[PDB]
Symmetry: C3
């Protein structure tokens, strides 16, 4: 029996070392995934009290951002499409103004 008992002790141990092998290569691909997430997630910076879009040495864009609600106490982020429509209306208004000034000028010439 005891040489049997020893046999079953080695069976249970060689199983232990292969359950451990599975752990160790596995733990690694997780510590790897955590490292990846730290580098590429947009993270809070406590030294500035804000989330920081710094990545690959500098300020970075955020894209694939859907339009934010335009309302009085909205906390939605706003996108360039939204901004473009504002920019467009501004350029129209500058042109209009110009032309109003010309007309005022013409009137002041008739008087």
């Amino acid at each position: 029996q005891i040489e049997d008992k020893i046999e079953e002790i080695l069976s249970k141990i060689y199983h232990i070392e292969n359950e451990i092998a599975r752990i160790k290569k596995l733990i690694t691909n997780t510590e790897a995934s955590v490292a990846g997430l730290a580098e590429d997630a947009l993270l809070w910076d406590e030294s500035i009290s804000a989330f920081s879009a710094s990545h690959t040495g500098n300020a970075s864009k955020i894209t694939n951002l859907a339009a934010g609600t335009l309302a009085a106490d909205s906390t939605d982020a706003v996108n360039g499409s939204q901004m473009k429509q504002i920019e467009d209306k501004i350029e129209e208004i500058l042109s209009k103004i110009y032309h109003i000034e010309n007309e005022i000028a013409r009137i002041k010439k008739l008087i």
Copy 2:
């Protein structure tokens, strides 16, 4: 003694397999948390060189965003509340312009 030695060898092994049980159900709830974070964190996309707010098939909003600083080289994100005030002022200016054009029209009728 040797049947005692064998007893203490099995004591140390049945402890090993229950320290290992604790590891394996634990490692799982961590590989689970890492998977969750990958899916729901706002992450850098190297194919576009920007953080991407894509989620659940499409562009997504960002909300609970506090007002950004409006200054010359500000890198703060801006919110819809901010934008709304700009939109409001634009609508006022369009109305004013309209009305200026009417008045100019009336003057040109008196001459």
Copy 3:
């Protein structure tokens, strides 16, 4: 031999318990890193169907954000620098308008 066999069984076990020690202090500094990432990553909130910049009790800023593209279907986030230029142009246009109204007023006084 069997007291040798027992010796080599204890050698393989005291190795097992120190490979396990390495695991357990290691797993901890990972479950720690996952907890940190959950707290400080900007994460999707399924109850609102948007990424949420809430952190340390309230709405938060996002900074170090590079300028977004201003174009018709842009999904880029826009920054305060961008917004400031819009704000500036608005303030110019209000002043101009004022002054146009004065001039219109003066003309209406001459007639």
